[PDB]
Design an enzyme around this catalytic site. Structure first.
Site, PDB file in Angstrom:
ATOM      1  N   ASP B 290      35.933  32.165  45.277  1.00  0.00           N
ATOM      2  CA  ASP B 290      35.873  33.592  44.950  1.00  0.00           C
ATOM      3  C   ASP B 290      35.316  34.380  46.127  1.00  0.00           C
ATOM      4  OD1 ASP B 290      35.320  31.779  42.517  1.00  0.00           O
ATOM      5  OD2 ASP B 290      36.054  33.547  41.556  1.00  0.00           O
ATOM      6  N   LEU B 295      37.001  37.538  48.115  1.00  0.00           N
ATOM      7  CA  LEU B 295      35.957  38.504  48.495  1.00  0.00           C
ATOM      8  C   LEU B 295      35.323  39.127  47.236  1.00  0.00           C
ATOM      9  CD1 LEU B 295      37.676  40.325  51.558  1.00  0.00           C
ATOM     10  CD2 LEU B 295      36.500  38.110  51.549  1.00  0.00           C
ATOM     11  N   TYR B 374      37.770  35.857  35.038  1.00  0.00           N
ATOM     12  CA  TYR B 374      36.317  35.598  35.119  1.00  0.00           C
ATOM     13  C   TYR B 374      35.520  36.796  35.576  1.00  0.00           C
ATOM     14  N   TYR B 376      31.462  37.502  36.917  1.00  0.00           N
ATOM     15  CA  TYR B 376      30.231  36.868  37.349  1.00  0.00           C
ATOM     16  C   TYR B 376      29.192  37.909  37.709  1.00  0.00           C
ATOM     17  CZ  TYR B 376      33.392  32.867  38.108  1.00  0.00           C
ATOM     18  OH  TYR B 376      34.326  31.854  37.960  1.00  0.00           O
ATOM     19  N   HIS B 425      31.855  25.624  38.279  1.00  0.00           N
ATOM     20  CA  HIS B 425      31.609  26.845  39.044  1.00  0.00           C
ATOM     21  C   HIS B 425      30.450  26.502  39.972  1.00  0.00           C
ATOM     22  CE1 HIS B 425      33.693  29.432  35.923  1.00  0.00           C
ATOM     23  NE2 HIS B 425      33.149  28.552  35.100  1.00  0.00           N
TER      24      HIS B 425
HETATM   25 CU    CU Z   1      33.747  28.047  33.196  1.00  0.00          CU
END
Ligand code: CU
Ligand code: CU
Ligand code: CU
Ligand code: CU
Ligand code: NA
Ligand code: NA
Lengths: 620, 620
Positions: B290, B295, B374, B376, B425
């Site tokens: 990522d 970026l 996703y 984060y 991850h």
């Molecule tokens: Cu996961």
């Protein structure tokens, strides 16, 4: 009318009255432990019987008794004389702690030792500590405490700054005799004070902290009924309090649609041990079983608003017995509040155009206790998403010694001449499981790496494996952080919508377990602490991982004796006992009062629900 | 006037102007990366030179360039043509992501595949994903993305609920050609929707949550000066932002008495990889870097008050370059606030009569990013007691597949027919250390058990050992949770009052590292992820554990190449690279939107201070 309600002042005075009437509580008797017994299994439409368990000490040296009383019925159910040399001494009485310093003050050997160090006996405090079981044959069947000395220069001085190393005494607190005074030689008594409220040490207090205000204008989102029944965000539980274990959670369940689904029947910290790792004979006997020997609930602090517990707080004020059977309230002993816990779930989706954010919250139930120099906070958390967590917060003043000239492999230096012996703080959480009811099993789950080859030509595949623990002989488990090891408690007869058994996964911190040599007295008395996870078949008399009587009690009871029965635990009424702890090499930053350090564990739903249980949480 | 200030809109437009004037930014050029360079070592009284690093792509297929510009001086410092087949492709451009679905919509092979599954091409979204490096020789030197299909039933539908398994396509996003369409056979497209704002699925929203109000009536206790310089409770730092790394902390220092003491010169998450563990050829190539490929800073969310960040919030709105060199603001992209953190220290002393309680607080600096499905959150925390912590919060919608009839060792079931491939991850924190300055060293500290015997007759002693990592060849370390392994960064030339080197101890979570076979493409491209801790000698060009160009780049760069130099790290300018991550076996509770899960690390002072640094915190 809940059978899980807290003990009332009236119930305790009634136990006193029943014992008195029965001839069991005359003037030489003292209550060393008193607590309500939980209802027996089943106990459906059967009428309640509130029963209390009592350990009665006798100050004249007669044998103590274990007694069960029905307060509902006004009767003694059973009373049995204990042979303490066999089954263990009763917990230490608060009144026995004072005895040590008082007796030592007129003992010629003690006075000689203090005079050799030019210390005024009037200024010498004695930490009266549990004795354990070592090589002293005359202590067997006797109530002994061991005293370590600390100089207090003036009434508000922190004595912990001034340990008197090379000196220890042993005292019989029933016969009121000093059995032994050991002086291995003088060490310098460290001279710097450790007075963390003295402006000389603190310097000018900071003026830079602006207030943080946490309020709930409509009140909290939890309700309290029946004194101690909590309902909050689908969760349901009863908050108990026991003088030994402290806060105990009962009947933890989650309302999923129309069904109240049990998860944990009873959760408690059933023991905590603080073993010291200094081989000096002055301290090599030092191991606190704060729960088993001292009774952590007894020393629970009264918690001040805006200080110990911040926000909109609801308090419980549990009642305990004093040494004579009179009720004593611990005002504001238990804090209950909810708090924000950041983001719960968030996704900004390009394709749908929907941006979604929801906040998490947790319900907090806590207490704090003080055992001499140490102060421990016990926190249980319930989260919106079904997660259950425990956290211990360790603070207080570190237990000190002299720092040896030329250093030490077992003690660190805090200040000039001042040492802190290495030690651990190790807890045992007893989780009487009830995942969708009582028919439960435990699997150990490890990550499984796979080799590049046929079926995995890019060498990217990984998997996992689950091993059912079928019998107690197979259920003593160690951590394996490297393989991501966890343990899943499931109900093999209750399946989610995908036809998988519902479960909860225990996530440990994988901290070191008991470091002592496996042949030591402490490895035997604290055998539970040598392994991360144990699973037993439920039994009503298997309450503590160290047995009922820990004080001056050798191995022979507790978890190792329980699992020898090798009972079926594959789809049965089972209990998980998780060991977790801190290993402390004290640092200069811990002195003169230690910042909180933490350890704990959590359980997260694992196919318990048919989808996320927090889809119905509202925005903002 | 700080050289560590955030890039301004004006600086970015000036870089654009300088590049244009220099003939480096004509109409076929695109900016794939632009960021300010940190000042070089020394840079004391020397005048500032604000320099920017730029990766320039060419849409006509000409070779890209790496360019350094002095915006202060209006010059190009250097410009070099890149051979991407050797050193790696430039990061993916936001404009290239759309290309995949558009091109596939008129490709005969793609349309045949969709028709075999009775899917309307107008309803088929394509997740355009990084390609990596596998067996396809024709991809070398080409910019490829691989597309996986998901059906979107209507504009507000969550397409992730409807993966189209057995189908993947590869697309050249420069020549705009579909290179390959692989159809391994039809799988049922899961039919249930995953619409977490649809009342049909949520049911009636809860009305049980009462408000929690967090306010600061006098404002926050931190100050912000120079746009991004923070002072809070003895801490001093600068909050940077880079389009690749996101939030970067500079010059973390603590004011101890009159002296501003450095701790960490630069802290960032220098990479994050999300490797998938499903050996199906539809996904066995799937690994998101990522940070390196996408970026993360570029996709940082605008964070809404009372929603993403609660309390008295101070925002930064960092500016980045678009593909043409125009400045683009991420409004409210960085949250800064302080929050209460429970009890800091507490002791109720019998002997002195003094009861003492103090509250903890932490400063929080965070951002949130969205990468496809996703989302984060990256959180840095500074605590009153000197502790520094990082936490990643993983949420979003899980990446889905079909769930195979008869099950899977590499995919879990979420809903009828719906699978979630296993994945990790894994983050790399790059900590350019400066413990009391730049002369630092690292020791690995393990707990040491001792055998009962002479010198330890009660078998209670335990100790620890520290091993100095002297050279880079010795500085690639693995976790050992069982022995309580930590790593201490100290300054051998700066001693505390007890004549011990000052230090900070890194406490890892000891989660599993990269699980892939060590001979896989991903083990080579993400070699950093195979070990918990690396220590290098500082160099200005050693920025990322995966090198400068990660996209479609084989092994050959990054940490394994850096440590081959076998440089002295014993009392030198060193960098610690800590790998930490989550291993995810998705559960039903993760569907249809996942509750946050977390992972992180912290560093605590270890003889850095001469006593507790929070004695001057005031009561209440
Ligand atoms: Cu996961
Ligand atoms: Cu003093
Ligand atoms: Cu400790
Ligand atoms: Cu749909
Ligand atoms: Na059970
Ligand atoms: Na450094």
């Amino acid at each position: 009318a809940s059978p899980f309600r807290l003990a009332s002042a009236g119930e305790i005075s009634e136990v006193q009255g029943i014992l008195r009437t029965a001839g069991l509580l005359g003037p030489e008797k003292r209550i060393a432990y008193l607590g309500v017994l939980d209802p027996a299994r089943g106990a459906g439409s059967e009428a309640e019987d509130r029963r209390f368990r009592v350990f009665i000490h006798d100050v004249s040296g007669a044998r103590p008794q274990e007694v069960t009383v029905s307060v509902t019925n006004g009767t003694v159910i059973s009373a049995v004389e204990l042979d303490t040399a066999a089954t263990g001494e009763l917990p230490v009485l608060e009144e026995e702690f004072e005895v040590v310093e008082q007796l030592l003050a007129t003992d010629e050997r003690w006075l000689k030792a203090l005079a050799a160090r030019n210390l005024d006996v009037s200024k010498v405090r004695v930490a009266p500590l549990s004795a354990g079981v070592f090589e002293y044959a005359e202590e067997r069947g006797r109530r002994i405490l061991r005293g370590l000395a600390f100089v207090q220069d003036f009434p508000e001085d922190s004595a912990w700054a001034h340990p008197v190393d090379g000196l220890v005494a042993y005292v019989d607190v029933v016969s009121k005799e000093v059995t032994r005074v050991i002086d291995t030689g003088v060490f310098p008594v460290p001279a710097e004070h450790g007075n963390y409220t003295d402006p000389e040490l603190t310097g000018p207090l900071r003026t830079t902290q602006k207030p943080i205000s946490i309020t709930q204008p409509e009140g909290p989102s939890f309700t309290v009924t029946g004194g101690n029944h909590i309902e909050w965000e689908k969760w349901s539980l009863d908050v108990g309090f026991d003088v030994r274990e402290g806060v105990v959670l009962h009947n933890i369940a989650f309302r999923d649609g129309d069904r109240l689904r049990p998860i944990i029947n009873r959760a408690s910290i059933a023991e905590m041990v603080v073993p010291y790792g200094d081989p000096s004979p002055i301290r090599s006997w030092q191991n606190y079983f704060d729960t088993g020997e001292y009774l952590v609930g007894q020393y629970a602090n009264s918690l001040e608003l805006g200080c110990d517990c911040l926000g909109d707080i609801t308090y419980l004020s549990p009642v305990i017995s004093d040494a004579f059977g009179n009720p004593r309230e611990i005002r504001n002993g238990i804090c209950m509040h909810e708090e924000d816990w950041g983001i719960l779930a968030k996704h900004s989706d390009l394709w749908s155009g929907i941006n979604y954010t929801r906040r998490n919250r947790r319900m907090v139930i806590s207490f704090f206790t003080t055992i001499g120099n140490y102060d421990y906070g016990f926190y249980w958390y319930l989260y919106l998403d079904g997660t259950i967590e425990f956290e211990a917060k360790a603070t207080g003043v570190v237990f000190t010694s002299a720092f040896p000239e030329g250093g030490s492999d077992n003690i660190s230096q805090l200040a000039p001449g001042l040492g802190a012996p290495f030690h651990q703080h190790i807890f045992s959480a007893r989780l009487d499981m009830a995942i969708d009811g009582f028919t439960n099993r435990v699997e150990e789950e490890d990550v499984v790496r796979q080799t590049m080859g046929p079926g995995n030509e890019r060498g990217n595949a990984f998997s996992r494996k689950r091993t059912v623990l079928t019998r107690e002989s197979e259920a003593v488990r160690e951590a394996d952080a490297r393989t991501g090891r966890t343990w899943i408690i499931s109900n093999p007869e209750s399946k989610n919508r995908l036809n998988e058994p519902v479960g909860y996964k225990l996530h440990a911190h994988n901290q070191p377990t008991l470091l002592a040599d496996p042949g030591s007295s402490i490895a035997r008395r604290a055998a539970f602490a040598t392994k991360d996870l144990w699973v037993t078949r439920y039994a009503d008399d298997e309450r503590y991982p160290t047995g009922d009587f820990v004080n001056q009690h050798s191995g022979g009871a507790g978890l190792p004796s329980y699992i020898a029965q090798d009972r079926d635990i594959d789809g049965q009424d089972i209990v998980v006992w998780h060991t977790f702890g801190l290993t402390h090499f004290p640092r200069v930053e811990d002195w003169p009062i230690m910042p909180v350090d933490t350890v704990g564990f959590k359980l997260r739903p694992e196919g318990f629900f048919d989808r996320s249980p927090v889809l119905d949480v509202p925005a903002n």
